[PDB]
Amino acid sequence: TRKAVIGYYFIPTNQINNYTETDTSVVPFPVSNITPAKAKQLTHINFSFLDINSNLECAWDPATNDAKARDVVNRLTALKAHNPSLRIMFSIGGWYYSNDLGVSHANYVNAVKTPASRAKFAQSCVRIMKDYGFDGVDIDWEYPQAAEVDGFIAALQEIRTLLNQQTITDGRQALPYQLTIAGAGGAFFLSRYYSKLAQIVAPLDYINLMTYDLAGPWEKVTNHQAALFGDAAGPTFYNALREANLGWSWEELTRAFPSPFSLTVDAAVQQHLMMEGVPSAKIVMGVPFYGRAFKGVSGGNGGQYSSHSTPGEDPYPSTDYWLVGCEECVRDKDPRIASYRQLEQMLQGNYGYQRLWNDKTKTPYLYHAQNELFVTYDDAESFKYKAKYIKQQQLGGVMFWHLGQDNRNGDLLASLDRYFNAADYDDSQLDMGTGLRYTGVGPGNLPIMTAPAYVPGTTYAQGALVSYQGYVWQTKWGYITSAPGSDSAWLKVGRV
Amino acid sequence: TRKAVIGYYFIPTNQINNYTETDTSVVPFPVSNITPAKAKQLTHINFSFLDINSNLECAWDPATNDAKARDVVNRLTALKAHNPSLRIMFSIGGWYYSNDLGVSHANYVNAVKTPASRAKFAQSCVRIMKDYGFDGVDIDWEYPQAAEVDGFIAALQEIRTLLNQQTITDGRQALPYQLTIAGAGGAFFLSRYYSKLAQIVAPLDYINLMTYDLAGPWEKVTNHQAALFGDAAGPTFYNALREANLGWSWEELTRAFPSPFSLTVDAAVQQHLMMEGVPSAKIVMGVPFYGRAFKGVSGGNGGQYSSHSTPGEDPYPSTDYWLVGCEECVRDKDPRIASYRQLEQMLQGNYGYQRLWNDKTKTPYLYHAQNELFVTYDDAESFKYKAKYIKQQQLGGVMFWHLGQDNRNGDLLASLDRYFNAADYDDSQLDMGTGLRYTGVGPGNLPIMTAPAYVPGTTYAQGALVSYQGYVWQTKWGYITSAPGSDSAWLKVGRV
Ligand SMILES: Cc1cccn2c(=O)c3cc(C(=O)N[C@@H](C)c4cccnc4)c(N)nc3nc12
Numbered sequence: 001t002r003k004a005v006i007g008y009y010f011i012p013t014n015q016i017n018n019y020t021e022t023d024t025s026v027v028p029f030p031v032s033n034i035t036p037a038k039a040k041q042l043t044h045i046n047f048s049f050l051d052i053n054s055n056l057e058c059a060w061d062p063a064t065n066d067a068k069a070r071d072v073v074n075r076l077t078a079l080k081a082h083n084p085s086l087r088i089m090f091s092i093g094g095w096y097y098s099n100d101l102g103v104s105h106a107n108y109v110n111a112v113k114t115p116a117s118r119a120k121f122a123q124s125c126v127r128i129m130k131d132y133g134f135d136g137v138d139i140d141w142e143y144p145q146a147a148e149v150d151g152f153i154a155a156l157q158e159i160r161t162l163l164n165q166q167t168i169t170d171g172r173q174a175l176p177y178q179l180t181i182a183g184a185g186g187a188f189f190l191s192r193y194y195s196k197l198a199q200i201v202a203p204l205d206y207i208n209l210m211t212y213d214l215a216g217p218w219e220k221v222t223n224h225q226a227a228l229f230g231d232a233a234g235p236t237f238y239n240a241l242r243e244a245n246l247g248w249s250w251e252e253l254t255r256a257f258p259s260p261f262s263l264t265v266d267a268a269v270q271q272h273l274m275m276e277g278v279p280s281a282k283i284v285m286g287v288p289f290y291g292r293a294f295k296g297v298s299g300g301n302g303g304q305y306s307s308h309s310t311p312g313e314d315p316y317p318s319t320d321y322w323l324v325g326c327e328e329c330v331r332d333k334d335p336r337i338a339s340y341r342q343l344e345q346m347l348q349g350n351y352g353y354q355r356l357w358n359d360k361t362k363t364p365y366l367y368h369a370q371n372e373l374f375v376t377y378d379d380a381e382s383f384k385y386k387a388k389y390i391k392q393q394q395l396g397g398v399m400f401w402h403l404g405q406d407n408r409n410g411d412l413l414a415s416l417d418r419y420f421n422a423a424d425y426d427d428s429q430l431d432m433g434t435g436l437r438y439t440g441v442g443p444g445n446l447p448i449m450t451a452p453a454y455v456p457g458t459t460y461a462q463g464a465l466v467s468y469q470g471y472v473w474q475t476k477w478g479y480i481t482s483a484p485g486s487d488s489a490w491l492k493v494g495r496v
Numbered sequence: 497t498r499k500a501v502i503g504y505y506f507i508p509t510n511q512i513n514n515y516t517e518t519d520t521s522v523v524p525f526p527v528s529n530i531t532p533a534k535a536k537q538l539t540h541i542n543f544s545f546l547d548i549n550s551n552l553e554c555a556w557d558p559a560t561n562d563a564k565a566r567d568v569v570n571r572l573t574a575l576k577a578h579n580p581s582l583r584i585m586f587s588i589g590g591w592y593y594s595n596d597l598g599v600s601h602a603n604y605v606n607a608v609k610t611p612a613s614r615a616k617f618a619q620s621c622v623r624i625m626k627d628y629g630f631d632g633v634d635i636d637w638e639y640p641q642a643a644e645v646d647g648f649i650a651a652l653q654e655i656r657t658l659l660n661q662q663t664i665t666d667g668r669q670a671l672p673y674q675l676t677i678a679g680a681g682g683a684f685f686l687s688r689y690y691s692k693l694a695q696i697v698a699p700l701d702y703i704n705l706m707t708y709d710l711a712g713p714w715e716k717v718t719n720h721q722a723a724l725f726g727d728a729a730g731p732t733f734y735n736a737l738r739e740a741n742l743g744w745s746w747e748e749l750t751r752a753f754p755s756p757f758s759l760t761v762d763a764a765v766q767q768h769l770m771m772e773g774v775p776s777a778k779i780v781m782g783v784p785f786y787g788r789a790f791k792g793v794s795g796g797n798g799g800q801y802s803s804h805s806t807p808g809e810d811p812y813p814s815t816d817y818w819l820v821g822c823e824e825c826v827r828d829k830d831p832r833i834a835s836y837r838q839l840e841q842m843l844q845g846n847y848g849y850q851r852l853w854n855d856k857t858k859t860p861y862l863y864h865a866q867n868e869l870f871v872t873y874d875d876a877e878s879f880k881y882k883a884k885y886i887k888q889q890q891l892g893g894v895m896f897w898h899l900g901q902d903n904r905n906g907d908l909l910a911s912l913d914r915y916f917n918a919a920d921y922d923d924s925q926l927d928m929g930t931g932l933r934y935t936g937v938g939p940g941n942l943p944i945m946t947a948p949a950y951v952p953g954t955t956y957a958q959g960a961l962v963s964y965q966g967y968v969w970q971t972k973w974g975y976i977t978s979a980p981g982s983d984s985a986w987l988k989v990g991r992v
């Protein structure tokens with residue numbers, strides 16, 4: 001089956017209200033820049049962002065010019081003329097609206113609180129979808145906390161019920177309405193809802209992992225923001241999932257969640273696959289179309305794993321635009337982020353940047369030796385390894401943030417489509433390297449094993465293996481007279 | 497409050513049927529050996545063992561001559577003339593009847609299953625108590641498994657109701673009928689029911705911990721069977737409580753259950769006190785009146801912590817009766833167990849045994865240099881430290897197995913009574929030594945702590961301490977925007 005290729009189309013309210021396809025100074029990436037060829041390379045466009053208002057309903061930003069918003073959306077859905085599989089989703093939430101300290105955060109908490117609120121909120125999602133002509137709903141709440149999770153699940157199940165009814169009512173069996181969420185791609189936020197992943201993902205077509213921003217100026221040491229695999233020379237992190245509300249035993253937590261660990265894309269994917277009832281085909285790997293820049297870095301290792309002097313604040317609390325050559329950093333008053341398009345132009349502009357490659361993480365980076373700068377980003381080469389990982393691990397596909405950051409030729413999108421679909425591309429010998437893999441093991445990714453059937457009445461010694469109720473179990477100590485599952489002495493170590 | 501001194505009186509069915517007070521070779525320890533002096537030193541005698549039959553009622557062994565049984569019991573209750581506080585309990589169960597592979601185990605499991613079965617079992621316990629003249633009920637099920645614990649708890653509650661009503665009916669307010677159980681003294685069996693200790697202990701007057709047999713021939717290395725504190729030179733063990741079904745986080749399990757650990761009397765007591773709702777006054781420390789012998793120890797340090805050639809099968813499968821001096825080893829055809837009485841006559845009779853002392857564990861042991869022998873046991877000196885521990889930790893008292901193993905003068909029982917009650921004994925300067933203490937922290941031993949109140953909307957760094965909803969919490973990583981208890985990021989570390 002075709003891998004999903006999910007591109008975010010983000011447009012701020014002031015750009016909707018002043019929308020034009022002819023002046024890149026007010027609208028840098030108008031819908032016009034999505035050519036028929038690029039539309040064929042996408043399977044989904046996530047239009048973003050809508051919000052939940054204090055009426056606990058899905059809504060546009062109050063300052064939106066609704067006439068212009070409908071026209072922007074109509075230009076997007078017109079791209080379906082070039083790609084019959086294309087879906088224009090809309091995204092509710094995002095960091096600014098929905099984070100704990102965000103302007104609308106309470107509206108997310110309250111909308112999922114009660115059966116009445118969830119019914120009302122779900123209806124409004126389907127009404128927005130049908131009124132504007134969208135093809136599905138994406139929820140980007142970053143992120144529900146443990147006690148909010150059951151309400152989150154029931155709202156998603158409510159949306160699933162209404163979308164499946166709307167699919168039948170509209171005769172959309174060939175292209176059913178879809179429901180997705182953006183998921184944490186790092187253990188710290190993932191531990192909020194990790195224990196209920198199975199019930200979260202059940203009503204979804206896809207969970208889109210935000211497997212980027214895994215490094216930033218809020219960390220004391222520079223690092224790669226979307227390392228595929230780990231580098232032993234880089235920083236490691238507390239494994240927050242061992243503290244999730246799982247109810248597992250000490251051995252089960254320990255073998256699933258080594259700590260410290262390397263905060264990588266592979267870690268995020270494997271951590272989802274470790275949960276029973278989380279199918280690989282629904283997991284979608286996010287990739288960034290932007291780089292993160294650091295200043296004040298030391299030398300020796302190309303700016304990698306160095307202390308730095310980058311402000312972590314938001315907004316950027318200065319007027320010092322120190323990322324040399326980055327015109328778009330001036331236009332946006334922040335030198336700590338650059339689009340792939342801009343980085344490509346910084347490279348071919350003789351600004352003293354050097355493009356280096358980390359063969360462990362399988363990601364590129366820029367080093368500026370004169371001014372002490374470090375940029376972590378992804379490109380078409382790092383996407384080869386990520387695409388191969390998606391195929392080997394049988395994931396659902398790829399998601400990226402965001403379309404306006406690709407270069408004008410659409411090279412990053414074309415590469416993702418090529419690695420999944422081009423008949424003359426062949427990655428069977430692509431060397432995935434010796435970077436650190438995530439070695440945790442959980443109930444959902446237990447190895448296949450064989451063992452003699454458990455025999456009631458037997459006394460087992462320490463380390464004995466038996467099969468019982470479809471799993472292979474090992475005794476943790478000696479003189480075991482109880483059945484696996486009936487007593488703390490048995491560890492589930494294998495399936496079938 | 498006077499400390500309990502609970503002595504098991506164990507008499508097998510063949511000795512009941514053949515009971516006589518004038519022939520040691522048929523009844524080695526008739527009740528007439530319990531003089532008025534000794535009766536005054538006890539608070540309880542646990543007559544043992546009764547059973548649960550296939551009708552799921554408390555019952556004598558079917559081969560018991562019932563008139564002979566009443567006579568033996570009458571000899572015990574006659575002792576109450578010399579001590580108005582003394583109670584003659586009867587014990588239901590024991591290892592042979594109630595272990596998973598024992599002959600009556602299914603009757604324990606099935607008696608506690610439903611309200612009807614529990615009411616029938618409980619009624620039978622009180623009927624037996626009144627019919628034979630006992631003063632209370634002791635249940636020694638070794639040990640209920642996790643799925644049986646709730647029924648076990650409800651059966652104990654039902655017995656408690658019937659006992660309390662019987663106390664009223666009989667005008668026994670001055671000496672009310674009591675309910676006790678034997679509890680596991682090591683973490684392996686403790687883990688079966690650990691999570692429900694509070695509801696198990698609620699209906700009891702006492703839980704008598706079997707804090708002995710903590711070492712034996714079944715282990716690869718010689719060790720003390722009832723060490724008070726740990727010896728760093730000694731073996732350590734897997735802390736099975738970390739695998740109990742508690743629902744705690746990795747950090748919480750790790751701090752409550754260090755592993756490996758020293759398997760000691762102190763460990764068992766502190767493990768019980770770690771659980772909320774378990775009052776120290778109900779905890780009774782078991783001590784052995786017997787030793788365990790190892791055949792084939794190397795030299796080095798008294799035979800402590802070395803390899804051995806002792807079989808670990810029961811029944812004793814062989815015939816090398818190799819514990820020399822020990823004549824009861826021939827009569828009972830097993831050289832690995834010797835009563836204190838016999839161990840004393842071995843030390844008296846020029847057999848080459850040397851008595852040594854471990855000042856970490858505060859226990860004695862015998863070493864034989866020629867035959868390579870090691871014996872771990874308890875004596876009046878080790879009981880000084882255990883009695884002081886009972887007083888310092890405010891435990892309910894002491895229990896021992898069993899009365900027939902004391903010497904003819906009853907020195908062990910007299911020593912326990914002395915250390916609790918003699919005005920001319922003064923342990924105020926007894927130094928408890930530097931042996932390893934169990935230092936796990938759980939809900940029941942959380943310290944008082946003080947921290948500024950949690951303030952919603954603020955972002956906390958790693959290691960921040962705040963007070964919230966009755967507890968002091970610490971963050972496990974940085975950028976914490978959630979409230980404590982509602983999250984994986986917060987660790988309960990203290991009480992307000
Ligand atoms: C300060 C801080 C602490 C911890 C986590 N943080 C974030 O996860 C975060 C995310 C974004 C954001 O917008 N990410 C983009 C890629 C995106 C795309 C699609 C859906 N959601 C988000 C942001 N601007 N600031 C952020 N700051 C923090």
Ligand SMILES: Cc1cccn2c(=O)c3cc(C(=O)N[C@@H](C)c4cccnc4)c(N)nc3nc12
Binds near residue numbers: 709712714
């Ligand atoms: C508390 C206690 C009291 C009396 C006897 N006990 C045991 O006999 C015993 C045995 C084992 C064990 O596992 N194996 C033994 C059989 C073994 C294994 C391999 C070779 N030889 C012998 C054990 N774990 N605890 C045990 N506890 C006790």
Ligand SMILES: Cc1cccn2c(=O)c3cc(C(=O)N[C@@H](C)c4cccnc4)c(N)nc3nc12
Binds near residue numbers: 504897
């Ligand atoms: C083979 C084996 C494995 C694991 C644990 N085991 C035991 O814990 C055990 C205990 C006894 C026993 O009698 N203990 C006395 C002190 C007692 C006193 C009062 C109430 N209950 C018991 C026993 N004879 N064999 C036992 N074998 C084992």
